[PDB]
């Protein structure tokens, strides 16, 4: 049918702060996941029209992708790291909800999720 608009990435009304955990999410976590061999399906919103997936946004009501996460980090959209971590987790969960277990895209998401969790384990202390 029609794609929804992409998620909001800037909000001038939200308060802003720069923290070492948010800097780490952008400069280490997002950077490492972006370069992974399986990252390319997750680098932009699902274009359900072009990909012939008419029921995608009937099922997935909280879409998320790493292009949006990158922009949110750049625009200081997040006040804390947990908000950004939730967005990565939403991205993976959407893939698991929509696709059959064991599909190619699920294996790709599972590999990215494993790497993501390894990097979140090394999240620096707030300081
Ligand atoms: C920016 C580029 O975008 C994409 C491009 C191409 C592409 O090169 N061609 C080539 C082969 C084509 N033929 C048609 C006949 N056919 C039986 C075989 C394939 C299709 C179009 C494919 C998928 C893309 N983009 C995507 N974005 C999120 C997802 C996503 N694909 N996959 C795929 C990525 C690789 C494995 C699955 C999903 C596919 C279906 C449902 C959900 C999801 C999903 O969850 N995600 C996250
Ligand atoms: C947009 C759709 O995308 C793909 C679809 C399918 C597919 O049949 N499903 C998967 C989705 C299934 N749903 C899941 C949700 N549920 C509710 C309903 C059921 C239905 C059927 C397979 C591969 C895809 N996407 C792809 N994108 C680039 C590549 C690519 N496949 N191929 C294959 C395309 C055909 C030959 C090989 C590659 C495979 C391995 C390595 C590289 C490449 C490669 O080079 N390219 C360019
Ligand atoms: C070197 C092996 O290679 C692959 C193997 C297999 C595989 O299990 N077979 C196939 C061979 C079978 N023999 C052959 C004859 N013999 C006598 C008996 C056994 C056994 C079973 C699947 C995909 C492969 N190769 C791949 N190359 C890039 C990509 C890629 N798969 N994935 C998948 C890998 C895991 C996650 C998804 C992609 C899939 C769809 C779209 C894009 C991409 C993508 O982005 N990349 C980077």
Reconstruct the topology from this structure.
Layout: H1 20-34, H2 56-59, H3 66-74, H4 81-98, H5 104-121
Helix pairs in contact: 1-3, 1-5, 3-4, 4-5
Bound molecules: ligand VYJ (3 copies).
Task: Give the beta-strand count.
Answer: 0
Shape: globular
Characterize the main sheet: none
Q: Could you give the order of the helices and strands?
A: HHHHH
Q: How far apart are the first and last residues' alpha carbons, in Å?
A: 47 Å
The rounded Rg comes to 15 Å
Write down the domain tally: 1
> How many helices in DSSP terms?
5
> For this entry, what is the oligomeric state of its chains?
monomer
Bound small molecules, by name, code or SMILES, are: the ligand CCOc1cc(C(=O)N2CCC(N3CCN(C)CC3)CC2)ccc1Nc1ncc2c(n1)N(C1CCCC1)c1ccccc1C(=O)N2C
Class from helix and strand fractions = mainly alpha
PDB class: gene regulation
Keywords: BET, ERK5, dual BRD-kinase inhibitor, gene regulation
Assembly: monomeric
Entry title: Crystal structure of the first bromodomain (BD1) of human BRD4 bound to ERK5-IN-1
């Amino acid at each position: 049918s029609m794609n929804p608009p992409p998620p909001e990435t800037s909000n001038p009304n939200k308060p802003k702060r720069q923290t070492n955990q948010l800097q780490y999410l952008l400069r280490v976590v997002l950077k490492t996941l972006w370069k992974h061999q399986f990252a390319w399906p997750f680098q932009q919103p699902v274009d359900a029209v072009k990909l012939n997936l008419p029921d995608y946004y009937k099922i997935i009501k909280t879409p998320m992708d790493m292009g949006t996460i990158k922009k949110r980090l750049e625009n200081n959209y997040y006040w804390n790291a947990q908000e950004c971590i939730q967005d990565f987790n939403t991205m993976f969960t959407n893939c698991y909800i929509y696709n059959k277990p064991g599909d190619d895209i699920v294996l790709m998401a599972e590999a990215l999720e494993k790497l993501f969790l390894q990097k979140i384990n090394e999240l620096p202390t707030e300081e």
